[PDB]
Scaffold this active site. Structure first.
Site, PDB file in Angstrom:
ATOM      1  N   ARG C 138      28.584 -18.543  61.662  1.00 41.47           N
ATOM      2  CA  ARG C 138      27.621 -19.512  62.176  1.00 41.47           C
ATOM      3  C   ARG C 138      26.315 -18.885  62.630  1.00 41.47           C
ATOM      4  O   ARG C 138      25.286 -19.562  62.673  1.00 41.47           O
ATOM      5  CB  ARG C 138      28.228 -20.349  63.297  1.00 41.47           C
ATOM      6  CG  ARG C 138      28.913 -21.600  62.789  1.00 41.47           C
ATOM      7  CD  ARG C 138      27.910 -22.580  62.179  1.00 41.47           C
ATOM      8  NE  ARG C 138      27.106 -23.252  63.199  1.00 41.47           N
ATOM      9  CZ  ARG C 138      26.342 -24.319  62.978  1.00 41.47           C
ATOM     10  NH1 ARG C 138      26.269 -24.857  61.766  1.00 41.47           N
ATOM     11  NH2 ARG C 138      25.654 -24.852  63.976  1.00 41.47           N
ATOM     12  N   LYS C 174      29.600 -25.449  66.279  1.00 39.81           N
ATOM     13  CA  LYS C 174      30.539 -26.551  66.073  1.00 39.81           C
ATOM     14  C   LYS C 174      31.879 -26.275  66.753  1.00 39.81           C
ATOM     15  O   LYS C 174      32.743 -25.592  66.200  1.00 39.81           O
ATOM     16  CB  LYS C 174      30.733 -26.837  64.574  1.00 39.81           C
ATOM     17  CG  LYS C 174      29.503 -27.407  63.861  1.00 39.81           C
ATOM     18  CD  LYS C 174      29.768 -27.619  62.373  1.00 39.81           C
ATOM     19  CE  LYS C 174      28.563 -28.214  61.658  1.00 39.81           C
ATOM     20  NZ  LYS C 174      28.822 -28.403  60.201  1.00 39.81           N
TER      21      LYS C 174
HETATM   22  N1  LIG Z   1      37.470 -16.679  56.699  1.00 37.37           N
HETATM   23  C1  LIG Z   1      36.425 -17.390  56.277  1.00 37.37           C
HETATM   24  N2  LIG Z   1      35.963 -17.219  55.025  1.00 37.37           N
HETATM   25  C2  LIG Z   1      34.919 -17.919  54.593  1.00 37.37           C
HETATM   26  N3  LIG Z   1      34.299 -18.811  55.364  1.00 37.37           N
HETATM   27  C3  LIG Z   1      34.704 -19.036  56.629  1.00 37.37           C
HETATM   28  C4  LIG Z   1      35.793 -18.317  57.112  1.00 37.37           C
HETATM   29  N4  LIG Z   1      35.996 -18.709  58.362  1.00 37.37           N
HETATM   30  C5  LIG Z   1      35.081 -19.633  58.656  1.00 37.37           C
HETATM   31  N5  LIG Z   1      34.283 -19.848  57.607  1.00 37.37           N
HETATM   32  C6  LIG Z   1      33.124 -20.832  57.582  1.00 37.37           C
HETATM   33  O1  LIG Z   1      33.133 -21.631  58.798  1.00 37.37           O
HETATM   34  C7  LIG Z   1      32.343 -22.822  58.517  1.00 37.37           C
HETATM   35  C8  LIG Z   1      32.659 -23.985  59.509  1.00 37.37           C
HETATM   36  O2  LIG Z   1      33.426 -25.072  58.904  1.00 37.37           O
HETATM   37  P1  LIG Z   1      33.132 -26.649  59.238  1.00 37.37           P
HETATM   38  O3  LIG Z   1      32.364 -26.696  60.506  1.00 37.37           O
HETATM   39  O4  LIG Z   1      32.566 -27.294  58.024  1.00 37.37           O
HETATM   40  O5  LIG Z   1      34.638 -27.246  59.523  1.00 37.37           O
HETATM   41  P2  LIG Z   1      34.934 -28.705  60.266  1.00 37.37           P
HETATM   42  O6  LIG Z   1      34.983 -28.489  61.731  1.00 37.37           O
HETATM   43  O7  LIG Z   1      36.104 -29.304  59.585  1.00 37.37           O
HETATM   44  O8  LIG Z   1      33.605 -29.599  59.954  1.00 37.37           O
HETATM   45  P3  LIG Z   1      33.548 -30.697  58.760  1.00 37.37           P
HETATM   46  O9  LIG Z   1      34.709 -31.786  59.107  1.00 37.37           O
HETATM   47  O10 LIG Z   1      32.149 -31.507  58.922  1.00 37.37           O
HETATM   48  O11 LIG Z   1      33.688 -30.103  57.402  1.00 37.37           O
HETATM   49  C9  LIG Z   1      32.727 -23.200  57.085  1.00 37.37           C
HETATM   50  O12 LIG Z   1      31.585 -23.751  56.415  1.00 37.37           O
HETATM   51  C10 LIG Z   1      33.202 -21.872  56.450  1.00 37.37           C
HETATM   52  O13 LIG Z   1      32.352 -21.482  55.362  1.00 37.37           O
END
Ligand SMILES: Nc1ncnc2c1ncn2[C@@H]1O[C@H](COP(=O)(O)OP(=O)(O)OP(=O)(O)O)[C@@H](O)[C@H]1O
Ligand SMILES: Nc1nc2c(ncn2[C@@H]2O[C@H](COP(=O)(O)OP(=O)(O)OP(O)(O)=S)[C@@H](O)[C@H]2O)c(=O)[nH]1
Ligand SMILES: C=C[C@@]1(C)CC(=O)[C@]2(O)[C@@]3(C)[C@@H](O)CCC(C)(C)[C@@H]3[C@H](O)[C@H](OC(C)=O)[C@@]2(C)O1
Ligand SMILES: [Ca+2]
Ligand SMILES: [Ca+2]
Ligand SMILES: [Cl-]
Ligand SMILES: [Mg+2]
Lengths: 190, 331, 186
Positions: C138, C174
């Protein structure tokens, strides 16, 4: 080979790229602890891995809460569309049981496009088979512009389906700007 | 039996022309669109000259202040989108091009950004204005349209195959080049030989030749080009001699090392060629060769050719010298 | 597969690359684009073999996002990651010289508890999970070009090791809310 490094990549047409993410990932992260999460994550993606092998999808990578496979690989397939559709189905079913086990609103958000890819590996150290193309880039956006517990398919993914599944207006232009600015007609599954 | 050639060089260097020449030499409604292009060249050629008149230091004045109104007509239409090219336009254009003060401006053109075909089209305005006008081959050669992106052109010569890749010479265009680096037979690197007294479009300060040299040094010493030879094209050879013989602007004033330089032994001058020209054109070539000697180590070489791109009679000749080189430079 | 306590995670992506990606007959339908990417990543992999970077363990690569971690083998491991992230810049710059491009790397670096291990019984691949990572990513995505973005904790740690920090401001992470972030001075 002597001037450019050796490239381990090859073109592959008529393939269908499934993308799947978890709605309510941070709200789940809020309940359980650092480890208790990884157990639920590993259990689901081990579960997911089996389904891919049946539904003739070759799984690519796991990016935190992002799971994505692609049918039509490693070797060509005329089912390539139908497999991903059947995959997302099993996936929304596979999240169900594990969701009921927690008792909190978590769901899979699926997205699938079709077309052409390049596939292989980049770099030297720590190889991990991956795919690249606009069609992958589109498929990704489909999942992003998806709806909870529903399978988001493209104009191209209906023309490989031979209309076996019953569809409905997708309205992906309103959920994602890349979809809007490229006038993609999207659909949903019944 | 298929060779992939890639045309590199700075903006306005001549790449686009070289391809046009291949279409002439070794290839086979459509031209009416180019007639429009030629008119555009004309419009902006005269409109640029007039605009330069006041901003020059010292400023240049019209020889006939009657022309001031025409001058005003030109600037009033400078930016007009889809120009109608009325008969007024040509009349006022010629008037200005006739004007001695305006010519004095052109004769000082190196001090502002002006296309190569100015004089050529301006001299034949009454030819161009006709409604049933058909451009000559030479008119198609001289017509300037900036290339943005990569454009492949295939052809056949004595049952041998060529793939020619035209790219953008400017700097924002140099990024795309990479895509043609892998699996290349050789580089054709083109150079505005005559542009020694000029700066670039990109920043109005960096010297065009000095730019071409530094761009060359980039290609010659590139990590993905270590094994690729570079067929050097010293273009605009007509315009060089014109400037040397004119002797209005000097080389030792933009490149002070030229004062030292004397003409090499292995000199193969053209019949009836002025020594001054010989001395000038080979100095330029030698500046380039100093880059092709410092590195390479016999892993890739350099093949100079004096070339005038708008001379089909000279392009056949030099491209024939090249065919000789490639026939053994794929073995 | 086990847990850890003080692991330093770095994400470095290339925003400028997605634009540069094309699909045309001239570039063999996006192959030549992916070919330069290879050259770049491969240059980044040529750094792990270095001695002062022996502690750096490359995890994976997301598109053009290079992902690595130090301390899987006191806080000198956090500093290493920075000298590493600097290094990628030298590697990404080097490319620019030869490739007539203008790529800029964008670096996010965090630290804390992670869980490292294998996921799925199909093809077992090494991966790290948890909050620490989520923040690391992030901070890359909300970052600025040519700049390394760090959290308030890392800000401090680097200040002991002789690195200066300039406050970015506040970020809405987030699930972790508003928090203060920093840039290491060039
Ligand atoms: N191990 C990992 N490898 C690659 N990316 C990761 C990893 N850990 C976290 N991320 C990244 O963390 C980001 C946060 O995810 P996001 O906030 O979209 O999930 P969420 O809380 O379900 O939100 P939404 O419901 O709007 O998709 C993702 O876009 C992802 O690319
Ligand atoms: N007098 C003279 N003019 C030439 C010669 N070669 C090219 N020109 C003229 O110079 C102009 C510019 O050449 P051009 O081919 O367009 O450069 P370019 O390499 O395509 O420039 P770019 O596309 O990278 S921006 C053309 O209009 C052409 O007629 C030459 O040898 N002598
Ligand atoms: C690297 C190539 C390129 C241009 C094309 C491509 O297919 C991608 O790799 C995908 C879509 C693709 O590889 C599938 C996974 C993921 C993670 C979704 C990629 C990223 O969004 C890439 O952009 C980033 C952020 O690196 C992207 C778009 O970049
Ligand atoms: Ca996500
Ligand atoms: Ca998510
Ligand atoms: Cl030049
Ligand atoms: Mg051109």
């Amino acid at each position: 080979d002597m001037m450019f490094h050796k490239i381990y990549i090859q073109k592959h047409d008529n393939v269908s790229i499934l993308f799947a993410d978890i709605e309510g990932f941070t709200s789940l992260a809020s309940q359980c602890t650092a480890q208790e999460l990884v157990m639920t994550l590993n259990e689901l993606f081990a579960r997911f891995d089996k389904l891919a092998a049946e539904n003739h999808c070759l799984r690519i990578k796991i990016l935190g809460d992002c799971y994505y496979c692609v049918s039509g690989l490693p070797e060509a397939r005329a089912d390539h569309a139908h497999c991903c559709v059947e995959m997302g189905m099993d996936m929304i079913e596979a999240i169900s049981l594990v969701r009921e086990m927690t008792g909190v609103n978590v769901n899979m958000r699926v997205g699938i496009h079709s077309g052409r890819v390049h596939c292989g590996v980049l770099g030297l150290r720590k190889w991990q088979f991956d795919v690249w193309s606009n069609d992958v880039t589109l498929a990704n956006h489909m999942e992003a512009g998806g709806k909870a517990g529903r399978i988001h398919i493209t104009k191209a993914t209906l023309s490989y389906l031979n209309g076996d599944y019953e569809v409905e207006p997708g309205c992906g232009g309103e959920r994602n700007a890349y979809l809007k600015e490229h006038s993609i007609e999207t659909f949903l599954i019944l | 039996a298929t060779h992939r050639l890639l045309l590199l060089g700075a903006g306005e260097s001549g790449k686009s022309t070289i391809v046009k020449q291949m279409r002439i030499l070794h290839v086979n409604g459509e031209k009416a669109t180019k007639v429009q292009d030629i008119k555009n060249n004309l419009k902006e050629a005269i409109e640029t000259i007039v605009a330069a008149m006041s901003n020059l230091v010292p400023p240049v004045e019209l020889a006939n202040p009657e022309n001031q109104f025409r001058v005003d007509y030109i600037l009033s239409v400078m930016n007009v989108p889809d120009f109608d090219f009325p008969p007024e336009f040509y009349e006022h254009a010629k008037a200005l091009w006739e004007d001695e003060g305006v010519r004095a401006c052109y004769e000082r053109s190196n001090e502002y950004q002006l296309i190569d075909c100015a004089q050529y089209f301006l001299d034949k305005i009454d030819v161009i204005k006709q409604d049933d006008y058909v451009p000559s081959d030479q008119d198609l050669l001289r017509c300037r349209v900036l290339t943005s992106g990569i454009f492949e052109t295939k052809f056949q010569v004595d049952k041998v195959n060529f793939h020619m890749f035209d790219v953008g010479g400017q700097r924002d265009e140099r990024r795309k080049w990479i895509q043609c680096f892998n699996d290349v037979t050789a580089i054709i690197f083109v150079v505005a030989s005559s542009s020694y007294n000029m700066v670039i479009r990109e920043d109005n300060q960096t010297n065009r030749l000095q730019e071409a040299l530094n761009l060359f040094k980039s290609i010659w010493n590139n990590r993905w080009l270590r094994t690729i030879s570079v067929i050097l094209f010293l273009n605009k050879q007509d315009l060089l001699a014109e400037k040397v013989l004119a002797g209005k602007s000097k080389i030792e004033d933009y490149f002070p090392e030229f004062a030292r330089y004397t003409t090499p032994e292995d000199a193969t001058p053209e019949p009836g060629e002025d020594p001054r020209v010989t001395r000038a054109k080979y100095f330029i070539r030698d500046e380039f060769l100093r880059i092709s000697t410092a590195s390479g180590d016999g892993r890739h070489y350099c093949y100079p050719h004096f070339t005038c791109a708008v001379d089909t009679e000279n392009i056949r000749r030099v491209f024939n010298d090249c065919r000789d080189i490639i026939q053994r430079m794929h073995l | 597969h086990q847990s850890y306590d003080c692991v330093c995670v770095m994400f470095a992506s290339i925003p400028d690359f997605k634009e540069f990606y094309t699909e045309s007959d001239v570039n063999k339908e996006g192959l030549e684009c992916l070919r330069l990417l290879n050259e770049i990543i491969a240059d980044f992999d040529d750094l792990l073999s270095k001695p002062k970077f022996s502690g750096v363990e490359k995890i994976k690569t997301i598109g053009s996002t290079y992902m690595a971690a130090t301390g899987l083998s006191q806080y000198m491991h956090i500093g290493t990651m920075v000298e590493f992230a600097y290094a990628l810049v030298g590697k990404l710059d080097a490319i620019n010289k030869h490739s007539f491009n203008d790529f800029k790397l964008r670096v996010g670096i965090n630290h804390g508890p992670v869980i490292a291990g294998v996921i799925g019984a199909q093809k077992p691949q090494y991966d790290i999970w948890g909050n620490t990572v989520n923040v690391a990513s992030r901070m890359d995505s909300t970052g600025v070009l040519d700049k390394i973005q760090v959290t308030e904790e890392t800000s401090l740690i680097l200040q002991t090791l002789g690195y200066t920090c300039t406050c970015r401001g506040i970020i809405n992470v987030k699930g972790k809310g508003d928090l203060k972030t920093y840039f290491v001075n060039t």
